[PDB]
Structure formats: structure tokens, C-alpha cells
Write a protein that holds these residues in place. Structure first.
Motif, PDB file in Angstrom:
ATOM      1  N   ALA A   1       1.273   3.181   8.413  1.00  0.00           N
ATOM      2  CA  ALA A   1       0.228   2.706   9.404  1.00  0.00           C
ATOM      3  C   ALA A   1      -0.609   1.705   8.564  1.00  0.00           C
ATOM      4  CB  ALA A   1      -0.820   3.990   9.662  1.00  0.00           C
ATOM      5  N   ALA A   2      -0.772   1.861   7.285  1.00  0.00           N
ATOM      6  CA  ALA A   2      -1.283   0.935   6.574  1.00  0.00           C
ATOM      7  C   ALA A   2      -0.593  -0.629   6.713  1.00  0.00           C
ATOM      8  CB  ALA A   2      -1.551   1.345   5.130  1.00  0.00           C
ATOM      9  N   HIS A   3       0.633  -0.461   6.499  1.00  0.00           N
ATOM     10  CA  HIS A   3       1.407  -1.664   6.623  1.00  0.00           C
ATOM     11  C   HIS A   3       1.341  -2.219   7.815  1.00  0.00           C
ATOM     12  CE1 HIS A   3       3.160  -0.054   2.731  1.00  0.00           C
ATOM     13  NE2 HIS A   3       2.616  -1.466   2.351  1.00  0.00           N
ATOM     14  N   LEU A   4       1.159  -1.673   8.898  1.00  0.00           N
ATOM     15  CA  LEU A   4       1.327  -2.194  10.331  1.00  0.00           C
ATOM     16  C   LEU A   4      -0.077  -2.813  10.225  1.00  0.00           C
ATOM     17  CD1 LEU A   4       2.008  -2.945  13.151  1.00  0.00           C
ATOM     18  CD2 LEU A   4       1.442  -0.397  13.955  1.00  0.00           C
ATOM     19  N   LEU A   5      -1.145  -2.465   9.888  1.00  0.00           N
ATOM     20  CA  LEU A   5      -2.588  -2.881  10.114  1.00  0.00           C
ATOM     21  C   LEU A   5      -2.611  -4.038   8.991  1.00  0.00           C
ATOM     22  CD1 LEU A   5      -4.882   0.521   9.631  1.00  0.00           C
ATOM     23  CD2 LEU A   5      -4.337  -0.992  11.832  1.00  0.00           C
ATOM     24  N   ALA A   6      -1.796  -4.096   8.136  1.00  0.00           N
ATOM     25  CA  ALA A   6      -1.802  -5.369   7.116  1.00  0.00           C
ATOM     26  C   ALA A   6      -1.082  -6.533   7.944  1.00  0.00           C
ATOM     27  CB  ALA A   6      -1.108  -4.814   5.840  1.00  0.00           C
ATOM     28  N   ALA A   7       0.097  -6.051   8.394  1.00  0.00           N
ATOM     29  CA  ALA A   7       0.706  -7.082   9.316  1.00  0.00           C
ATOM     30  C   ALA A   7       0.088  -7.697  10.210  1.00  0.00           C
ATOM     31  CB  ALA A   7       2.001  -6.431   9.871  1.00  0.00           C
ATOM     32  N   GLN A   8      -0.878  -6.717  11.471  1.00  0.00           N
ATOM     33  CA  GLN A   8      -1.631  -7.282  12.177  1.00  0.00           C
ATOM     34  C   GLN A   8      -2.702  -8.191  11.744  1.00  0.00           C
ATOM     35  OE1 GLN A   8      -3.026  -3.277  13.714  1.00  0.00           O
ATOM     36  NE2 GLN A   8      -1.651  -3.858  15.474  1.00  0.00           N
ATOM     37  N   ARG A   9      -3.037  -7.882  10.300  1.00  0.00           N
ATOM     38  CA  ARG A   9      -4.282  -8.615   9.809  1.00  0.00           C
ATOM     39  C   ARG A   9      -3.812  -9.926   8.905  1.00  0.00           C
ATOM     40  NH1 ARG A   9      -9.544  -5.945  10.136  1.00  0.00           N
ATOM     41  NH2 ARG A   9      -9.352  -4.152  11.657  1.00  0.00           N
ATOM     42  N   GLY A  10      -2.506 -10.413   9.288  1.00  0.00           N
ATOM     43  CA  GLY A  10      -2.042 -11.358   8.616  1.00  0.00           C
ATOM     44  C   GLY A  10      -0.999 -11.230   7.385  1.00  0.00           C
ATOM     45  N   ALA A  11      -0.763 -10.222   6.804  1.00  0.00           N
ATOM     46  CA  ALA A  11       0.149  -9.959   6.018  1.00  0.00           C
ATOM     47  C   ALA A  11       1.651 -10.487   6.438  1.00  0.00           C
ATOM     48  CB  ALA A  11       0.122  -8.716   5.272  1.00  0.00           C
ATOM     49  N   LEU A  12       2.288 -11.267   5.591  1.00  0.00           N
ATOM     50  CA  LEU A  12       3.673 -11.712   6.029  1.00  0.00           C
ATOM     51  C   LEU A  12       4.730 -10.932   5.462  1.00  0.00           C
ATOM     52  CD1 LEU A  12       3.117 -15.488   6.914  1.00  0.00           C
ATOM     53  CD2 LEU A  12       4.072 -13.642   8.611  1.00  0.00           C
ATOM     54  N   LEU A  13       4.463 -10.039   4.174  1.00  0.00           N
ATOM     55  CA  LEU A  13       5.670  -9.503   3.626  1.00  0.00           C
ATOM     56  C   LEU A  13       5.080  -8.164   3.053  1.00  0.00           C
ATOM     57  CD1 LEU A  13       8.503 -10.075   2.502  1.00  0.00           C
ATOM     58  CD2 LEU A  13       7.490 -10.807   0.148  1.00  0.00           C
ATOM     59  N   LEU A  14       5.633  -6.993   3.350  1.00  0.00           N
ATOM     60  CA  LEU A  14       5.307  -5.571   3.232  1.00  0.00           C
ATOM     61  C   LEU A  14       5.999  -5.121   2.309  1.00  0.00           C
ATOM     62  CD1 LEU A  14       4.855  -4.783   6.858  1.00  0.00           C
ATOM     63  CD2 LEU A  14       3.003  -5.304   5.305  1.00  0.00           C
TER      64      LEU A  14
ATOM     65  N   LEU B   1       0.837  -1.166  -0.017  1.00  0.00           N
ATOM     66  CA  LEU B   1       0.101  -0.089  -0.120  1.00  0.00           C
ATOM     67  C   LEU B   1       1.004   1.188   0.082  1.00  0.00           C
ATOM     68  CD1 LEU B   1      -1.365  -2.053   2.698  1.00  0.00           C
ATOM     69  CD2 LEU B   1      -3.295  -0.785   1.674  1.00  0.00           C
ATOM     70  N   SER B   2       2.285   1.081  -0.374  1.00  0.00           N
ATOM     71  CA  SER B   2       3.093   2.163  -0.095  1.00  0.00           C
ATOM     72  C   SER B   2       2.944   3.327  -1.042  1.00  0.00           C
ATOM     73  CB  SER B   2       4.637   1.672  -0.375  1.00  0.00           C
ATOM     74  OG  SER B   2       5.547   2.488   0.048  1.00  0.00           O
ATOM     75  N   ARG B   3       2.425   4.329  -0.547  1.00  0.00           N
ATOM     76  CA  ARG B   3       2.407   5.552  -1.093  1.00  0.00           C
ATOM     77  C   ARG B   3       1.394   5.716  -2.150  1.00  0.00           C
ATOM     78  NH1 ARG B   3       8.575   7.944  -1.773  1.00  0.00           N
ATOM     79  NH2 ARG B   3       9.250   7.541   0.309  1.00  0.00           N
ATOM     80  N   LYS B   4       0.589   4.664  -2.122  1.00  0.00           N
ATOM     81  CA  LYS B   4      -0.302   4.791  -3.064  1.00  0.00           C
ATOM     82  C   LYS B   4      -1.797   5.767  -2.874  1.00  0.00           C
ATOM     83  CE  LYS B   4       0.454   0.464  -4.764  1.00  0.00           C
ATOM     84  NZ  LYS B   4       0.187  -1.029  -4.791  1.00  0.00           N
ATOM     85  N   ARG B   5      -2.316   5.977  -4.258  1.00  0.00           N
ATOM     86  CA  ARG B   5      -3.457   7.132  -3.958  1.00  0.00           C
ATOM     87  C   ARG B   5      -4.295   6.888  -3.116  1.00  0.00           C
ATOM     88  NH1 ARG B   5      -8.730   7.615  -6.686  1.00  0.00           N
ATOM     89  NH2 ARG B   5      -8.625   5.459  -6.911  1.00  0.00           N
ATOM     90  N   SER B   6      -4.869   5.424  -2.503  1.00  0.00           N
ATOM     91  CA  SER B   6      -6.214   5.302  -1.602  1.00  0.00           C
ATOM     92  C   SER B   6      -5.621   5.965  -0.293  1.00  0.00           C
ATOM     93  CB  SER B   6      -6.235   3.769  -1.569  1.00  0.00           C
ATOM     94  OG  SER B   6      -4.924   3.078  -1.174  1.00  0.00           O
ATOM     95  N   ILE B   7      -4.055   5.780   0.046  1.00  0.00           N
ATOM     96  CA  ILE B   7      -3.698   6.351   1.144  1.00  0.00           C
ATOM     97  C   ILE B   7      -3.828   7.654   1.085  1.00  0.00           C
ATOM     98  CG2 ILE B   7      -1.680   6.477   2.823  1.00  0.00           C
ATOM     99  CD1 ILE B   7      -3.115   3.599   2.568  1.00  0.00           C
ATOM    100  N   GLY B   8      -3.411   8.474  -0.116  1.00  0.00           N
ATOM    101  CA  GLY B   8      -3.411   9.811  -0.215  1.00  0.00           C
ATOM    102  C   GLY B   8      -4.916  10.075  -0.142  1.00  0.00           C
ATOM    103  N   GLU B   9      -5.727   9.401  -0.677  1.00  0.00           N
ATOM    104  CA  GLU B   9      -7.138   9.926  -0.517  1.00  0.00           C
ATOM    105  C   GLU B   9      -7.693   9.687   0.870  1.00  0.00           C
ATOM    106  OE1 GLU B   9      -7.835  10.879  -4.649  1.00  0.00           O
ATOM    107  OE2 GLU B   9      -9.569  11.020  -3.020  1.00  0.00           O
ATOM    108  N   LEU B  10      -7.496   8.781   1.701  1.00  0.00           N
ATOM    109  CA  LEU B  10      -7.920   8.853   3.224  1.00  0.00           C
ATOM    110  C   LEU B  10      -7.350   9.909   4.086  1.00  0.00           C
ATOM    111  CD1 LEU B  10      -7.464   4.792   3.569  1.00  0.00           C
ATOM    112  CD2 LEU B  10      -9.447   6.119   3.505  1.00  0.00           C
ATOM    113  N   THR B  11      -6.187  10.401   3.920  1.00  0.00           N
ATOM    114  CA  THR B  11      -5.563  11.187   4.624  1.00  0.00           C
ATOM    115  C   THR B  11      -5.260  12.595   3.957  1.00  0.00           C
ATOM    116  OG1 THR B  11      -3.132  10.461   3.512  1.00  0.00           O
ATOM    117  CG2 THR B  11      -4.018   9.260   5.616  1.00  0.00           C
ATOM    118  N   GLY B  12      -5.598  12.913   2.825  1.00  0.00           N
ATOM    119  CA  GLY B  12      -5.682  14.246   1.992  1.00  0.00           C
ATOM    120  C   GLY B  12      -3.988  14.545   1.914  1.00  0.00           C
ATOM    121  N   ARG B  13      -3.408  13.329   1.391  1.00  0.00           N
ATOM    122  CA  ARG B  13      -1.973  13.850   1.102  1.00  0.00           C
ATOM    123  C   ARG B  13      -1.637  13.435  -0.534  1.00  0.00           C
ATOM    124  NH1 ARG B  13      -1.017  16.726   5.526  1.00  0.00           N
ATOM    125  NH2 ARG B  13      -1.141  15.317   7.386  1.00  0.00           N
ATOM    126  N   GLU B  14      -1.808  14.537  -1.135  1.00  0.00           N
ATOM    127  CA  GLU B  14      -1.635  14.464  -2.625  1.00  0.00           C
ATOM    128  C   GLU B  14      -0.417  13.977  -3.165  1.00  0.00           C
ATOM    129  OE1 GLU B  14      -1.025  18.274  -4.784  1.00  0.00           O
ATOM    130  OE2 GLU B  14      -1.121  17.119  -6.660  1.00  0.00           O
TER     131      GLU B  14
END
Ligand SMILES: O=C(O)c1cc2ccccc2[nH]1
Ligand SMILES: Nc1nc(Cl)c2nc[nH]c2n1
Ligand SMILES: Nc1nc(Cl)c2nc[nH]c2n1
Lengths: 266, 269
Positions: free
Chosen positions: A231-244, A207-220
């Protein structure tokens, strides 16, 4: 997993006993290619110093001829295999690039097309290296149930890969955040990421620096999206992702380190 | 959801809120050659409001084994900052002090909350907060040996909630804080964060402050406070997931972004 995934990346071992960090090394010439190769190598060395567990080297924006993609990635792979002890992934959907990159020292294929390019299944079966199968619609549409559709697609690709002779232990899956998906679809996939972890294969989240992150946080701009991405990568790791798959290696390592200390408390 | 009336400025704890740190100390700034300490603190509080802080915590008392600040100097620092920020922001303002004279003067100047590291143990603090009718943070501070840091911090906070209620302070105006980093090792801080839901069962909102603290530096190997931003944002997100409704931070924009991503994800049924 009873036994943690152990990926043999052409002799370089990637152990998924905890979430690991895949550092992004883009080799695509921009407005600012021998100088491109030099800059990509220096960047990959910086990411290794920052604590990346694997580097993902890509020479094509996610259409360039195979010879041009090779001119970009091969010198970077040859230099990084000699100057780092890290496993190296090649970000390509072209079978001839997969074969040439592995011969140059790459130990994993990261395929945005999930081996759908003619010959890709045969190449990965022959190469016996790990492979990432990502979801992408064709090559943002409406989904009735994005989680169910991504799940169905990944089951089909895992099966296609196993039937081509690729060992299930060499696979990784990735929902493809940002590839033909609205912000709402990406948030749904992240919230329901544990459902994709039930396919018996490690999940990679990018989810690195992706548009969806930009839309959620208002970061162009991409570098303005670093906090939301970590934050998105930590949430992904908590939800089972093993590679970020990240640009911000040191920051992601720090976030995962704090979480690991907390999660370790009985 | 807790609804804190901070002298007319409402802080709604329907989701974790961000408390921006405004330190009014000459050592907090490097532009003193041509700026006053007050003007630098006011500009910093305005920047934190722009970054999305839900409230600002203004404190005048920052050094290793810090020298106690005399009351007159603490007033000289915090009162002009509160007067300027109350006129230039719409945010609730907290005063970070343990001195009743500063609590009274700060509320008269426009502060709407008291953040007390001594949990109203200074003589007169209970009478001041009971009179002032503003919300108050009761923090734990005794690194000493704990047989059970979680149970000891919980026991202390129950005692201080009781002391405050018995002094006539409405239970609805109370907040509690385990006091990360105050007489606690990294292991103690990690234990308190991991067991934070246990403190959230006291019926009062919980504030967590781990911002750029030594324990974050120890966990991540980051020597300088400014290098601890990512680990601090992660710690604050973990605290919010574990029930904290207020987060005391230096890195407001980054913390707001992290909580915003988490809110979007948590909102999925
Ligand atoms: O910040 C300060 O105390 C300070 C800055 C500065 C610049 C020039 C001369 C003296 C000075 N003092
Ligand atoms: N596997 C993978 N995943 C994601 Cl999200 C990507 N974004 C660009 N290339 C990518 N490769
Ligand atoms: N309430 C409160 N909490 C924490 Cl952690 C602090 N650290 C410094 N001042 C503080 N005030």
C-alpha cells in the motif's frame, strides 16, 4: 518530465516512463560466506522472475572492511550479471566497493550516504553510472520541518554531485524512509513526496517492511508488514516516486499493474 | 458522515469500512470430513472480525454458472450462521440474498443489513425491506454489450434508489454498488472503477467489491483466486480513494492494513 528518465546502467537500460520496481537482494551473513552467496543469487533470480526492473545487491547492514563487503557482493554481482538481463545496483557507501562492483558488472550505485564518504564523488564521476542519493542524518532526531530539511539536503547533494562532474541525468534521490525518522516524519515525507519530485530528478521510495509501516498497522515482524508496504509503495508511486525499493516484488508489480490500468482511463 | 443503524449495531461511514465475505457453501471449505458447513462459516466470520472487519456479509448462494439455491437450503445455511455470529461478535451483520423470505428470516435471526444483488427486484423484496427498517445495498446486475457502462449503471442505480424511496424505504438506509464482475468485461470493470466518483454523487454510500474477481486475475495474470490478493487490495484502495465507503473483501487483514496506511497519509494537512 518532458522526456522520461532513461538510465543507462552499464548497458542495461532502466526506463522510468512508469514506476519501476527495485528488488532487494541482501548478502549479509545472519544466524543461518559461500552459502550466503548461493542464497542471494537464487533470491535475485526469483525477484527477476517476479518482474523486478532492477536488483539492488547489498553486503552491509544499513562497520565492515571493504575486503569483507567485496567478498559478499562481488560473487553475487558476477553470477547475477551472467544469469539475468536486469540492471544491477550495488548498495554501498564505500568508493572502493563502488569501483570494484562496477568492474564486476554493477550498473548503478545506491548510496545511503549520498556520496559523503571521502572519495565517493570522484569515484561516481569517474564511473559514469547512475547513483541514488539518499537522505540520512549523519551516518531519530527532531526536525522543525522534515520535508524542508530533506529537500535542502538533497539539493546540496545533487549540486555537490553536479560540481564533481556527475551528469544530472544519472542522479536519483531518495528521502530515506526509516533513516533517522519517526513514524510521523515518514508519513509527512510520504504525504509531501510531490514536493521532492520538483528537484528535476527521479525519486526512489523504500518503505519495504520498515518499522514505520509496522507501527501504523500494528505488525511487529518484517513479513507481517507486506500488505502495508505494498500500500505504501502504491501511495508513493501515486505521489511521484518512479522507483520503488521492495522485498515483495510480485505483490508490488500486481498493485502497480491494477493502478496503471485505472490511471490509463481518460 | 453516513451513520447506518444495522439493527442496533452502528456502522459509521466517516472513513471506508471493510465488509468481510462469509460464504456458507460446502464448496467454500475443505475441512468438511470432520466439520459442518455452518461451523466452518462461523469460525471464518470470527477470524474476519479478529482481522478488523467492520461488518460481515453472510451469504448462502459459489460455482462457475452457479446452480440456483432453493430457499429452504439457503435458510439452512445462513440462519444458523447469523444466530451464532450475532451472539459471538459485536459487528453489524449483512445477509447477502435476493429472496424476501430469507431477508425476513435473517433479520429475525439477527442480521442488520440486506445486501441484494437484484436491487430489490424480486417480488416482495421492496415490501420486506420497507417493513424490516434495516439498511440495504442496491447492486447493479444486468457479459452484455453496453453503449456506455458508466452511464447505464448510474441510470439503473438512480431508478432503484427511486423505487426503494417510493416503496417507503428511508433514503438514509440505502447503499449502492456498481456490481463489479456481474455481466461486465474487465474493460467495463476498469471504466466503472476509474469513474467511481460519478456514482458517489447520488447522495448515498457506495460499496465496491472486486475481491479476487476474474478482472483482477486478468489485469495481473493471476489464474487462481488465492493469487489475486495483492491486486484485490490495490483495487479496493483505489475504490476507497475514488469515494467508496464500503469494501467487500475476502482478505480482511490485508485490506485493513492498506486502508490504515492510506488513512495516515490522507490525514496530513
Ligand atoms: O470435505 C469433504 O466433503 C470430505 C472430506 C473427507 C475426508 C475423508 C472422507 C470423506 C471426506 N469428505
Ligand atoms: N536507497 C535506499 N533507500 C532505502 Cl529506503 C533503503 N533502505 C535500505 N537501503 C536503502 N537504500
Ligand atoms: N453487494 C455485493 N457486491 C458485490 Cl461486488 C458482490 N459480489 C458477490 N456478492 C456481492 N454483493
Amino acid at each position: 518530465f518532458d522526456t522520461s528518465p532513461r538510465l543507462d546502467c552499464a548497458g542495461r537500460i532502466l526506463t522510468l516512463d512508469r514506476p519501476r520496481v527495485m528488488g532487494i537482494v541482501n548478502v549479509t551473513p545472519d544466524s543461518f560466506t559461500h552459502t550466503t552467496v548461493e542464497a542471494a543469487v537464487a533470491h535475485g533470480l526469483r525477484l527477476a522472475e517476479e518482474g523486478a526492473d532492477l536488483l539492488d545487491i547489498g553486503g552491509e547492514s544499513t562497520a565492515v572492511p571493504v575486503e569483507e563487503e567485496l567478498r559478499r557482493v562481488i560473487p553475487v554481482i558476477e553470477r547475477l550479471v551472467a544469469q539475468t538481463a536486469l540492471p544491477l545496483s550495488v548498495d554501498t557507501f564505500k568508493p572502493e566497493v563502488m569501483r570494484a562492483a562496477v568492474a564486476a558488472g554493477a550498473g548503478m550505485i545506491n548510496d545511503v550516504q549520498a556520496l559523503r564518504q571521502p572519495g565517493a564523488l570522484d569515484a561516481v564521476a569517474d564511473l559514469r553510472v547512475p547513483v541514488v542519493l539518499m537522505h540520512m542524518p549523519g551516518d531519530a532526531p527532531h526536525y522543525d520541518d522534515v520535508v524542508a530539511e530533506v529537500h535542502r539536503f538533497l539539493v546540496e547533494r545533487i549540486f555537490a554531485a553536479e560540481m564533481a562532474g556527475i551528469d544530472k541525468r544519472r542522479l536519483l534521490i531518495d528521502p530515506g524512509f526509516g533513516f533517522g525518522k519517526s513514524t510521523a516524519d515518514n508519513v509527512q515525507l510520504l504525504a509531501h513526496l510531490p514536493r521532492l519530485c520538483e528537484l528535476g530528478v527521479p525519486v526512489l521510495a523504500g518503505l519495504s517492511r520498515k518499522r514505520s509501516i509496522g507501527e501504523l498497522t500494528g505488525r511487529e515482524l518484517p513479513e507481517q508488514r507486506v500488505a502495508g508496504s505494498v500500500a505504501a509503495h502504491l501511495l508513493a508511486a501515486q505521489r511521484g516516486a518512479l522507483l520503488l525499493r521492495v522485498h515483495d516484488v510480485a505483490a508490488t508489480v500486481d498493485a502497480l499493474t491494477v493502478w496503471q490500468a485505472v490511471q490509463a482511463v481518460p
